[PDB]
Amino acid sequence: RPERRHTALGMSLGGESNYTPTYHVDPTGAYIQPTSYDQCMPVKTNINKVL
Amino acid sequence: GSGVGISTGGWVGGSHFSDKYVVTKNTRQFITTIQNGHLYKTEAIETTNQSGKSQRCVTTPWTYFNFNQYSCHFSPQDWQRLTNEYKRFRPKAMQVKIYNLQIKQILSNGADTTYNNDLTAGVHIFCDGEHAYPNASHPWDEDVMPDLPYKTWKLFQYGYIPIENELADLDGNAAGGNATEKALLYQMPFFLLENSDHQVLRTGESTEFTFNFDCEWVNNERAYIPPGLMFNPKVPTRRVQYIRQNGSTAASTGRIQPYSKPTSWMTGPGLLSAQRVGPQSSDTAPFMVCTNPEGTHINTGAAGFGSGFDPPSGCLAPTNLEYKLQWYQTPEGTGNNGNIIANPSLSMLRDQLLYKGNQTTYNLVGDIWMFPNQVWDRFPITRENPIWCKKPRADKHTIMDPFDGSIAMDHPPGTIFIKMAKIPVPTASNADSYLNIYCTGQVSCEIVWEVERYATKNWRPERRHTALGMSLGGESNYTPTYHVDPTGAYIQPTSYDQCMPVKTNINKVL
Amino acid sequence: GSGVGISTGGWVGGSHFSDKYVVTKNTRQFITTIQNGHLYKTEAIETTNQSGKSQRCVTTPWTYFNFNQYSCHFSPQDWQRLTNEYKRFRPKAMQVKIYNLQIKQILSNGADTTYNNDLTAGVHIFCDGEHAYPNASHPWDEDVMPDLPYKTWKLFQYGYIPIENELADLDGNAAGGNATEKALLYQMPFFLLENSDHQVLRTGESTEFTFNFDCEWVNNERAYIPPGLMFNPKVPTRRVQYIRQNGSTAASTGRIQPYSKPTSWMTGPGLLSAQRVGPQSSDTAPFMVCTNPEGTHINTGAAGFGSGFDPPSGCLAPTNLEYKLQWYQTPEGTGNNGNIIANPSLSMLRDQLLYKGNQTTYNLVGDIWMFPNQVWDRFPITRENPIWCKKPRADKHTIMDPFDGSIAMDHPPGTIFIKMAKIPVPTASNADSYLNIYCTGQVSCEIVWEVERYATKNWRPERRHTALGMSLGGESNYTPTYHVDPTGAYIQPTSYDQCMPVKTNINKVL
Amino acid sequence: ESTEFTFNFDCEWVNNERAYIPPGLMFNPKVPTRRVQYIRQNGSTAASTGRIQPYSKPTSWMTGPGLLSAQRVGPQSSDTAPFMVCTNPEGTHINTGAAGFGSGFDPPSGCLAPTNLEYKLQWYQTPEGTGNNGNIIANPSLSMLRDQLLYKGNQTTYNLVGDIWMFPNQVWDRFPITRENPIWCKKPRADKHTIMDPFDGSIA
Amino acid sequence: GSGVGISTGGWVGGSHFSDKYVVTKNTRQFITTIQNGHLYKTEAIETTNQSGKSQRCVTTPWTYFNFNQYSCHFSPQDWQRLTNEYKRFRPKAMQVKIYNLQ
């Protein structure tokens, strides 16, 4: 089967007027921080390992 | 050693990913049977006959191996890893083996039937790599190798269309006498697979065929902006835009604005004008590619003669559902059940449009042809798409982009034909009775795929094909896509995104 | 030569004892059949449903060879001689051969069935030594190789648990919408044994697999005293014992008595607190090891999610029968019939206790965890115990002592999978009918065991496993243990001591 | 002028692979088991001996250690952690007690399921971040070697074991580190130490 | 040559992914200032003093480079590609350069 992967679709908009994605720069120049643990792209999620 | 009781080859499968190469091995269990009672026949293929659409094919005894689709060679895991980790891929080489043959006799007394292994019966196996016979494979056929390695592969009969029927219709009239119409029949080619030399194999024997591709790449990288935005909106431009007088407003000369600069690039070709026709029975496509030499007689007209060209819009935005490419996952699929519709891959070289402005406003250009400075991306193939298409042999041809996405090769992989060697039976009549047998065996296709890994200076994350992009199915609906129902049924993807298309994930600077 | 009519291998068996090595050879006659009609299926495993305990497994067509148990490799004579004459032993190397295959077709007309040998049918054989597929073998299964070399070995179907069911339960609610619960399903692995390459064998052919262990020893030597008595009661001690004031009695400082010196060593870990739960149907173990990630929905709770950890008391004295390890000799065994309960081996590193004193008296510490200076002996394995256990792949793990006694190996012997190659049958429908066959053959496991002989300065005799330690059984009850009933039934040991455990006979100075 | 410094690590791997099932389900539910489950008499119901069911086999593996018993204390100002690791040699004087002396050990639950938000690891992306603004809470990675629990059954039912210590046959995965986690941690210089898993996920 | 007016080193950055190795390069512009007026001091660190929690630290003039976090070394792209394509990773070697001082 397919496996889970960290995807940019796992991101949210932010900044002023809220059209800037995560990890991107606000019109003021501010860098949009991830708002959730999954936008931080943790390990031990994607790849499967037979026990 | 060799003989009955010594297996000819083992089972191969899996995939080995590298940086330069991907080697996908597969093995299936196939069954082929006596077709047409060992006869060649040319019969008319008739629909409900509500319209005069008809076809004529010559059906052989032969059956054939169709390896053309991605679903066969890649598992959903192998595909996901392919389209996530690699910007482009093509098939270096292909190796097919047919081994572990078993020819068994079918003994039927009343209802119950028994199976006895004769061991002296052979099978004919013929690979056409020169394409001297008409091609069996055609894109989007259901004859293709199965997805699941443990399913049996039932081969399909080989046939071909000797002539275009309505051209040969004989309908004519008393006034014309259809002389040019008979001339088409008089030269109507008839191909026997027995002309060529081919191998006859018994149970102990096997065979092997190797093919070497040379073809174009399949590019997995996405365009984030249209080629029209390839400029810098901060820098002013030197160009002038003169607008002629419109009504009251006077003609104005002025510098083009910095934020909208002129593009040197234009929309990839496609045709939105036409619409589908008629009932599901007749050929419905919006455009009909047909041949109508002078003097022949066509009574039905329209789609009776000619084959429909679909999808008509190559790069253009599929305004309507008619234009969107669509298929079924399973041959059991009926209307709206199990159908998958192509959706935007969100690649800006894909789903283009072109607007012709008048003085007051802009209007959609229905059909656009090849024009210089057109750039576009080929259809975002999924895992269920055909791999290749056979390019016709013709003097002249334009750029080859099949709008289904398949690669047009002038020498695709040869079609491997196989049939039961006819075992005659004594009969006092002319009834030319034969012995009823079938052959099952193990075919293994092993392809070497040439891949090249992406590299990017992009800071941000990129889209990837994820299993979270799947839906539940089956009975009680707790089984995911690409997984097996409690009954044993394999859960098919219900959406284009579950088919994991290319040209979605990886970004490419225009 | 090779072919039908030439046996591939002969029968091997017996044991050759040496000082350094013991080589135990065994050969059995196995039979495997078509499983699931050549399908993969994921179905719910449902109990009486008095409790919400449920399971979901994906059942394959494959069957497998389980060699894990001592009873298979050693006869009662070979075991007695092993445990009497040797202080420790481990499996150097293992060699499995599968030969003399016979694939026969099952012809059933009405009630009576006939068996015809086709000779062209193969079998798939696959050994997983990398453990890429889920492990088939689990300790204490009934699927293991038979004890008696003349009994037929019927293999069991291979299946595995793709997901924890209650985590995937779909139960949820209207408020939560079970998003994290679908996420577990969306990534639920699905393994096909057809992915990997494997061998296909006909009657003339055979195959062979070798394995090389590296693992810990199994120590047969007994502790005559606890590590707490490792002192000399005649010599005075320098230490002081201060006892705080208790009630009226004043605080007393004084030298510790010579006969009871302080021990630097503590009780091996174990858990006596928990007790078993519920009916025999549900999972009853005293402790439940479970996983409950946030956001998932569990309606049943308790043992519905999670697997029970038993025996809970690793080294501790089994206060109650619940804690004692227990099994059945024969799959026909029902409650109290043919069950064997583990008894004390009278090893003083085994069956330890720990008492927490207050001022007035001492009280039993219910559950003790890993603590420094803990020394203990592993479970005194008998001849019916599993040899090995598969250690999970995990970042961190503590000391590995399975309380069943088995050895935890991170790469145990590979599981050999075998199945009937599917022989398809022609059918006018989609009914995908197949030909009904089975395969019997001869498998021979030959293991090289690394042994080392004891030496002692003890003057006295030591305990040894003796045939006088047996009981009569069978009809008329004149047949001993490990012997054959007049009907032909093999008399099973009725007690733990007739199973000849280790860590009983030989003494080891602490 | 400039300068240059080179360092050579030798350390443990950071494993990115997920466990799809708990180690307790490592069996085959179709194959029967040889084991017996004896249940002592409970109330009226008599003691029953019987074969363990095929679908639930005993596991040889146990829950990774962690501590759920403690709870956080006091105002945000003082050290709030649920457990306090402190040193109090004899003869010294401590007036304040409690968390005044000692440093808090958090997150207390290493592998265990974070029953409450207090136990979940949490941080801020930006130093401008105040309460609930810009804070990120660790969530389940859906790895079955992670977020384990252990239930102690009595005769009638099962109950959660609050705090579990190192015990043999414990297997677990380290914290699912994100991109914002520290890479390493400095292991103290000490005579004895147990297994090193920092519950923040960093490498010691 | 060397001296004022000759830059000591250039800017490095990016990442090169391989099968065995990943080399993540980074360069930053740092600023350090006089701390404590060039003094060592041991002062009590006092909170609101609602509770008796207190701390004592000796503060140096020195400042230091902290490289410890993954966010520093990997971009979100380099991280995504790391965690999607690789089952395990560890830091072989580290090389720090301090140049172009002003």
PDB file of N, CA and C in Angstrom, chain A residues 37 42-44, chain C residues 395-396, chain D residues 14-16 107 109-112 114 119-123 136-141 143 145-147 172-182 197-202, chain E residues 70:
ATOM      1  N   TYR A  37       1.765  20.549  15.478  1.00  0.00           N
ATOM      2  CA  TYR A  37       2.867  19.601  15.565  1.00  0.00           C
ATOM      3  C   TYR A  37       3.105  18.911  14.232  1.00  0.00           C
ATOM      4  N   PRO A  42       7.207  15.792  12.061  1.00  0.00           N
ATOM      5  CA  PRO A  42       7.934  14.895  12.956  1.00  0.00           C
ATOM      6  C   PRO A  42       8.358  13.611  12.268  1.00  0.00           C
ATOM      7  N   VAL A  43       9.257  12.889  12.931  1.00  0.00           N
ATOM      8  CA  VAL A  43       9.684  11.580  12.455  1.00  0.00           C
ATOM      9  C   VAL A  43       8.784  10.518  13.067  1.00  0.00           C
ATOM     10  N   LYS A  44       9.031   9.256  12.719  1.00  0.00           N
ATOM     11  CA  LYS A  44       8.284   8.109  13.241  1.00  0.00           C
ATOM     12  C   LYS A  44       6.810   8.172  12.861  1.00  0.00           C
TER      13      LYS A  44
ATOM     14  N   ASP C 395      13.578   1.505  19.199  1.00  0.00           N
ATOM     15  CA  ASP C 395      14.737   2.316  19.534  1.00  0.00           C
ATOM     16  C   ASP C 395      15.366   1.856  20.835  1.00  0.00           C
ATOM     17  N   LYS C 396      14.587   1.845  21.907  1.00  0.00           N
ATOM     18  CA  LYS C 396      15.077   1.509  23.229  1.00  0.00           C
ATOM     19  C   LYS C 396      14.411   0.232  23.702  1.00  0.00           C
TER      20      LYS C 396
ATOM     21  N   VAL D  14      18.760   8.266  14.689  1.00  0.00           N
ATOM     22  CA  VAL D  14      17.410   8.770  14.894  1.00  0.00           C
ATOM     23  C   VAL D  14      16.507   8.063  13.898  1.00  0.00           C
ATOM     24  N   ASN D  15      15.636   7.197  14.399  1.00  0.00           N
ATOM     25  CA  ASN D  15      14.880   6.277  13.562  1.00  0.00           C
ATOM     26  C   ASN D  15      13.557   6.912  13.157  1.00  0.00           C
ATOM     27  N   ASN D  16      13.312   6.971  11.851  1.00  0.00           N
ATOM     28  CA  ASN D  16      12.165   7.652  11.257  1.00  0.00           C
ATOM     29  C   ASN D  16      11.018   6.702  10.958  1.00  0.00           C
ATOM     30  N   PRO D 107       8.952  16.146  30.258  1.00  0.00           N
ATOM     31  CA  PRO D 107       7.712  15.409  30.512  1.00  0.00           C
ATOM     32  C   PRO D 107       7.935  14.127  31.289  1.00  0.00           C
ATOM     33  N   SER D 109       6.088  11.381  31.534  1.00  0.00           N
ATOM     34  CA  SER D 109       5.653  10.142  30.893  1.00  0.00           C
ATOM     35  C   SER D 109       6.495   9.961  29.649  1.00  0.00           C
ATOM     36  N   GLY D 110       7.414   9.002  29.691  1.00  0.00           N
ATOM     37  CA  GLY D 110       8.307   8.843  28.563  1.00  0.00           C
ATOM     38  C   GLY D 110       7.629   8.247  27.352  1.00  0.00           C
ATOM     39  N   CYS D 111       7.198   6.996  27.458  1.00  0.00           N
ATOM     40  CA  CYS D 111       6.454   6.355  26.393  1.00  0.00           C
ATOM     41  C   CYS D 111       4.957   6.355  26.610  1.00  0.00           C
ATOM     42  N   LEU D 112       4.489   6.679  27.806  1.00  0.00           N
ATOM     43  CA  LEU D 112       3.096   6.459  28.131  1.00  0.00           C
ATOM     44  C   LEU D 112       2.216   7.470  27.422  1.00  0.00           C
ATOM     45  N   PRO D 114       0.000  10.464  26.946  1.00  0.00           N
ATOM     46  CA  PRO D 114      -0.171  11.693  27.720  1.00  0.00           C
ATOM     47  C   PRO D 114      -1.633  11.936  28.030  1.00  0.00           C
ATOM     48  N   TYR D 119       1.175  16.660  30.476  1.00  0.00           N
ATOM     49  CA  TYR D 119       2.228  15.704  30.167  1.00  0.00           C
ATOM     50  C   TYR D 119       2.746  15.890  28.749  1.00  0.00           C
ATOM     51  N   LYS D 120       1.913  16.412  27.856  1.00  0.00           N
ATOM     52  CA  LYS D 120       2.324  16.590  26.472  1.00  0.00           C
ATOM     53  C   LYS D 120       3.459  17.596  26.378  1.00  0.00           C
ATOM     54  N   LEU D 121       4.472  17.260  25.586  1.00  0.00           N
ATOM     55  CA  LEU D 121       5.566  18.186  25.349  1.00  0.00           C
ATOM     56  C   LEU D 121       5.070  19.367  24.533  1.00  0.00           C
ATOM     57  N   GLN D 122       5.538  20.559  24.880  1.00  0.00           N
ATOM     58  CA  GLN D 122       4.979  21.776  24.321  1.00  0.00           C
ATOM     59  C   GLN D 122       6.044  22.862  24.317  1.00  0.00           C
ATOM     60  N   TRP D 123       5.986  23.742  23.323  1.00  0.00           N
ATOM     61  CA  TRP D 123       6.973  24.811  23.207  1.00  0.00           C
ATOM     62  C   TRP D 123       6.353  25.978  22.452  1.00  0.00           C
ATOM     63  N   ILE D 136       3.026  25.141  20.345  1.00  0.00           N
ATOM     64  CA  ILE D 136       2.829  23.894  19.620  1.00  0.00           C
ATOM     65  C   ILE D 136       2.850  22.748  20.611  1.00  0.00           C
ATOM     66  N   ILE D 137       1.830  21.902  20.547  1.00  0.00           N
ATOM     67  CA  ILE D 137       1.655  20.779  21.455  1.00  0.00           C
ATOM     68  C   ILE D 137       1.970  19.508  20.690  1.00  0.00           C
ATOM     69  N   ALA D 138       2.740  18.618  21.304  1.00  0.00           N
ATOM     70  CA  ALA D 138       3.029  17.345  20.665  1.00  0.00           C
ATOM     71  C   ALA D 138       1.769  16.498  20.580  1.00  0.00           C
ATOM     72  N   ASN D 139       1.575  15.860  19.438  1.00  0.00           N
ATOM     73  CA  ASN D 139       0.420  15.025  19.162  1.00  0.00           C
ATOM     74  C   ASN D 139       0.891  13.620  18.845  1.00  0.00           C
ATOM     75  N   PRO D 140       0.000  12.635  18.908  1.00  0.00           N
ATOM     76  CA  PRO D 140       0.400  11.268  18.574  1.00  0.00           C
ATOM     77  C   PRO D 140       0.918  11.163  17.150  1.00  0.00           C
ATOM     78  N   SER D 141       2.064  10.509  17.005  1.00  0.00           N
ATOM     79  CA  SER D 141       2.598  10.166  15.699  1.00  0.00           C
ATOM     80  C   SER D 141       1.957   8.906  15.144  1.00  0.00           C
ATOM     81  N   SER D 143       2.436   5.917  16.088  1.00  0.00           N
ATOM     82  CA  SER D 143       3.390   4.822  16.143  1.00  0.00           C
ATOM     83  C   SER D 143       3.038   3.961  17.341  1.00  0.00           C
ATOM     84  N   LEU D 145       4.676   1.813  18.998  1.00  0.00           N
ATOM     85  CA  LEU D 145       5.670   1.780  20.056  1.00  0.00           C
ATOM     86  C   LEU D 145       5.679   3.061  20.858  1.00  0.00           C
ATOM     87  N   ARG D 146       4.730   3.946  20.593  1.00  0.00           N
ATOM     88  CA  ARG D 146       4.645   5.238  21.238  1.00  0.00           C
ATOM     89  C   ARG D 146       3.238   5.380  21.797  1.00  0.00           C
ATOM     90  N   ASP D 147       3.117   6.126  22.894  1.00  0.00           N
ATOM     91  CA  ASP D 147       1.825   6.386  23.537  1.00  0.00           C
ATOM     92  C   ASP D 147       1.186   5.101  24.055  1.00  0.00           C
ATOM     93  N   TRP D 172      10.130   0.352  23.422  1.00  0.00           N
ATOM     94  CA  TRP D 172       9.454   1.598  23.117  1.00  0.00           C
ATOM     95  C   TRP D 172      10.278   2.379  22.111  1.00  0.00           C
ATOM     96  N   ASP D 173       9.640   3.369  21.500  1.00  0.00           N
ATOM     97  CA  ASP D 173      10.306   4.288  20.599  1.00  0.00           C
ATOM     98  C   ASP D 173      10.498   5.640  21.261  1.00  0.00           C
ATOM     99  N   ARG D 174      11.607   6.278  20.918  1.00  0.00           N
ATOM    100  CA  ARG D 174      11.919   7.587  21.442  1.00  0.00           C
ATOM    101  C   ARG D 174      10.949   8.617  20.890  1.00  0.00           C
ATOM    102  N   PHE D 175      10.918   9.771  21.537  1.00  0.00           N
ATOM    103  CA  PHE D 175       9.971  10.814  21.175  1.00  0.00           C
ATOM    104  C   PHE D 175      10.066  11.117  19.682  1.00  0.00           C
ATOM    105  N   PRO D 176       8.947  11.307  19.004  1.00  0.00           N
ATOM    106  CA  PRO D 176       8.983  11.591  17.568  1.00  0.00           C
ATOM    107  C   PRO D 176       9.456  12.999  17.283  1.00  0.00           C
ATOM    108  N   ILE D 177      10.769  13.199  17.189  1.00  0.00           N
ATOM    109  CA  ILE D 177      11.306  14.544  17.090  1.00  0.00           C
ATOM    110  C   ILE D 177      10.801  15.233  15.832  1.00  0.00           C
ATOM    111  N   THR D 178      10.552  16.527  15.951  1.00  0.00           N
ATOM    112  CA  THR D 178      10.226  17.412  14.854  1.00  0.00           C
ATOM    113  C   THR D 178      11.467  18.150  14.391  1.00  0.00           C
ATOM    114  N   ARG D 179      11.255  19.142  13.535  1.00  0.00           N
ATOM    115  CA  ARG D 179      12.357  19.945  13.033  1.00  0.00           C
ATOM    116  C   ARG D 179      12.799  20.977  14.060  1.00  0.00           C
ATOM    117  N   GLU D 180      11.957  21.254  15.056  1.00  0.00           N
ATOM    118  CA  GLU D 180      12.285  22.256  16.065  1.00  0.00           C
ATOM    119  C   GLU D 180      12.915  21.669  17.313  1.00  0.00           C
ATOM    120  N   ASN D 181      13.236  20.386  17.314  1.00  0.00           N
ATOM    121  CA  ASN D 181      13.768  19.770  18.510  1.00  0.00           C
ATOM    122  C   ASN D 181      15.274  19.989  18.599  1.00  0.00           C
ATOM    123  N   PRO D 182      15.825  19.991  19.805  1.00  0.00           N
ATOM    124  CA  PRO D 182      17.280  19.973  19.942  1.00  0.00           C
ATOM    125  C   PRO D 182      17.868  18.706  19.353  1.00  0.00           C
ATOM    126  N   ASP D 197      17.272   7.508  27.457  1.00  0.00           N
ATOM    127  CA  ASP D 197      16.293   8.120  26.566  1.00  0.00           C
ATOM    128  C   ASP D 197      15.837   9.434  27.166  1.00  0.00           C
ATOM    129  N   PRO D 198      16.280  10.579  26.668  1.00  0.00           N
ATOM    130  CA  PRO D 198      15.653  11.831  27.086  1.00  0.00           C
ATOM    131  C   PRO D 198      14.250  11.923  26.525  1.00  0.00           C
ATOM    132  N   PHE D 199      13.303  12.290  27.385  1.00  0.00           N
ATOM    133  CA  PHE D 199      11.910  12.260  26.963  1.00  0.00           C
ATOM    134  C   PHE D 199      11.564  13.449  26.082  1.00  0.00           C
ATOM    135  N   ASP D 200      12.475  14.412  25.957  1.00  0.00           N
ATOM    136  CA  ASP D 200      12.295  15.458  24.961  1.00  0.00           C
ATOM    137  C   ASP D 200      12.666  14.957  23.577  1.00  0.00           C
ATOM    138  N   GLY D 201      13.359  13.827  23.504  1.00  0.00           N
ATOM    139  CA  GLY D 201      13.768  13.242  22.252  1.00  0.00           C
ATOM    140  C   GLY D 201      15.219  13.446  21.897  1.00  0.00           C
ATOM    141  N   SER D 202      15.912  14.358  22.569  1.00  0.00           N
ATOM    142  CA  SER D 202      17.278  14.691  22.201  1.00  0.00           C
ATOM    143  C   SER D 202      18.217  13.527  22.475  1.00  0.00           C
TER     144      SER D 202
ATOM    145  N   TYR E  70      17.386  21.119  15.052  1.00  0.00           N
ATOM    146  CA  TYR E  70      17.348  20.698  13.659  1.00  0.00           C
ATOM    147  C   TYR E  70      16.937  21.845  12.755  1.00  0.00           C
TER     148      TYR E  70
END
